[PDB]
């Protein structure tokens, strides 16, 4: 299933923000009457209410979910320096169009 992770661009925007890349939702119920005698008790409030919705590292910590390994980790075991290919994911990509034949071969 296609990932629809909308990559962020401004650090000065809310973490949860209706991006312009996202197609608008075109706006348009057995509820009880207001006079119905249901009262929420005095010491009842939504669960986390003093907790702010987003923090200054909520946008960045969501972008880490969609990072390539090892950046989608937060702990792990060390490797040897020679066991880490830094270009093995470069040539697993599609053969680039327009490069001379030597590069594609």
**Where do contacts with other proteins occur on this chain (CB under 8 A)?**
1-10, 12-27, 29-34, 38-48, 51-55, 57-62, 64-65, 72-75, 89-90, 93-95, 97, 101-102, 104-105
How far apart are alpha carbons 40 and 62 in whole angstroms? 35
Nearest CA-CA partner of 70 in 59, 53, 83: 83
How far apart are alpha carbons 96 and 105 in whole angstroms? 11
- Decide whether 28 or 79 has the Cβ nearer to other proteins: 28
- Decide whether 42 or 83 has the Cβ nearer to other proteins: 42
Tell me how far, at minimum, the Cβ of 74 lies from other proteins, in Å.
6
- Decide whether 73 or 82 has the Cβ nearer to other proteins: 73
DSSP 74-94: SS-----GGG--SSTTTTTSP
Tell me how far, at minimum, the Cβ of 25 lies from other proteins, in Å.
5
Tell me how far, at minimum, the Cβ of 26 lies from other proteins, in Å.
6
Cβ atoms of residues 32 and 38 within 8 Å: yes
């Amino acid at each position: 299933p296609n990932v629809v992770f909308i990559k962020t661009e401004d650090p000065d925007l809310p973490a949860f923000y209706f991006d312009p890349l996202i197609n608008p939702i075109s706006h348009r119920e057995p509820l009880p009457d207001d006079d119905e005698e249901f009262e929420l008790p005095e010491f009842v409030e939504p669960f986390l209410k003093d907790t702010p919705l987003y923090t200054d590292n909520t946008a960045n910590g969501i972008a880490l979910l969609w990072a390539p390994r090892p950046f989608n980790l937060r702990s792990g075991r060390t490797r040897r320096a020679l066991d880490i290919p830094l270009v093995k994911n470069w040539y697993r990509e599609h053969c680039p169009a327009g490069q001379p034949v030597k590069v594609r071969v």
